[PDB]
Symmetry: C2
Subunit: 299 residues, 2 copies
């Protein structure tokens, strides 16, 4: 029997497990970033956060199921782990998965778990349609349980073809790449969700033109000077904190006169004559507080 | 029995490769479109994306050529995987005795050049993109590694010693998959970086507006505060300004795209209505920011 055979499978599995650990770290980082984004402006990142969380928990449940099968077969072979020429039995799995030419309930459970993952994921995204459906194609191609036809014409059963008669390390590698598929689908899904949100924020559908002339007191026919600037209108924007100093008095009576109902910062403050308004709008973006200065005047 | 699992893994990897590659092509196309719409913004992102596209496609084509060379020797058909078991030509062609032949060393050099310039392109192990750099290094590395025994194996050997032709093919397919996955992660990171630069509140200043303004006296104040966009790199593609029916604001004249504002300084003979449309190309679509304001001048 080929000594180098099933050693190749071991190298597959080692590379795949290392990559999967790195991918899980990156995915957890991305989820933490999303939760931080939901912390400030929850309105913008809400749906993104919940759908990403659902993907996270589905992916984790499914990954843990696969990993349980992997640990099962690891116990099956024995304590020798980095030795691979030993995982050659092709016995425990089939008798753990099928009855003669029929599925065992747990094998049925395994396949229906796969199908459940796919269908809930795609229905979360909006199946085969809507925004980013090519991702649905990717997931379908990755987890597809449709019975395949062999080159010899037999429509072999999906689990039977995928798993029967194979060395324990072989199905171990199969499951490792299934896990890698789950991690890749995660990484991609968080990518699309956050990207779609960002594009929903950058869209100049969110803006509105304004006039920012130095002074409105334009005398008799003198040459004009002014500008057009894209004032923000998207109500989803919300200054996380506001400090709004008046003419050196009554720093921002809290929502007594300021109202961020719309992104129009309606200030219903009082007055006595000439006035200036100063302060800072604190936006907690991506884990950093940024102060946007305010220095304006009013009669 | 005959380990067709290698063949199945290879075929799935290849199908995933076309799907991922189509996605990558589309992603770069979208970057190209955005760069066409707004070159100053997506300029660096598009340049880095096209450099990594060149590098990735060169590397992918090299590996694909090696894979094709291998699948030449297999025979007339390309699915009878049990036939693909000789493992006698490829091992011959990479190396003689211990030392690499001057093509295997070229292969490893290609891998290492790819990783080196890719990392140096993505900043580096430090700065941003660090986790992605870790993924690249872990996926692509030829540091000589030690087997079960405490003895060091050369990378090309340990990965490509007498392994069945289909096994080597599947390993190379995994390498291709890593290249494509790295492509998509890289493009996503570059785009996310650009967007998050665009949504940064460091891009804004604060303006106000009211119905009339002055009140000569202390009565009240129904003002509002807005986030004017002061990003230099954002600019309309089309600027149609039929202010009050007279002309297109002398397009060469006062309307100035030099900064984000449109530094209008037009004529003055009374109260003036400025009206028109701002046309921003965004992901293809022609978004239309209407402009409709009044500035009054005594004539």
């Amino acid at each position: 029997m080929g000594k180098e055979v099933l050693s190749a499978f071991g190298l597959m599995n080692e590379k795949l497990e290392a990559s999967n650990e790195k991918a899980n770290n990156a995915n957890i980082n991305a989820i933490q970033a999303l939760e931080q984004n939901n912390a400030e402006n929850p309105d913008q990142f809400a749906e993104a956060f919940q759908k990403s969380k659902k993907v996270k928990e589905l992916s984790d449940s499914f990954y843990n199921y696969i990993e349980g099968i992997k640990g099962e077969v690891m116990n099956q072979v024995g304590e020798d782990k980095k030795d691979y020429q030993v995982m050659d039995k092709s016995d425990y799995l089939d008798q753990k998965f099928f009855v003669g030419d029929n599925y065992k309930p747990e094998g049925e459970e395994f396949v229906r778990q796969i199908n459940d993952y796919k269908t809930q994921l795609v229905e979360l995204l909006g199946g085969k349609e809507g925004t980013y459906g090519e991702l649905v194609g990717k997931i379908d191609g990755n987890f597809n349980t449709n019975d395949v036809v062999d080159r010899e014409g037999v429509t072999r059963k999906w689990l039977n073809y995928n798993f029967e008669g194979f060395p324990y390390i072989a199905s171990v590698a199969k499951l490792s790449m299934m896990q890698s598929d789950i991690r890749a689908t995660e990484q991609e899904v968080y990518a699309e969700m956050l990207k779609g949100q960002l594009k929903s924020q950058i869209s100049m559908t969110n803006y509105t033109t304004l006039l920012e002339q130095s002074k409105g007191a334009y005398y008799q026919g003198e040459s004009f000077d002014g500008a057009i600037v894209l004032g923000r209108k998207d109500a989803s924007t919300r200054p996380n904190e506001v400090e709004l100093m008046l003419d050196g008095r009554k720093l921002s009576a809290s929502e007594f006169q300021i109202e961020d109902g719309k992104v129009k910062l309606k200030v219903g403050a009082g007055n006595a004559g000439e006035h200036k308004i100063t302060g800072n709008l604190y936006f907690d973006q991506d884990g950093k507080r940024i102060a946007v200065p305010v220095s304006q005047v009013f009669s």
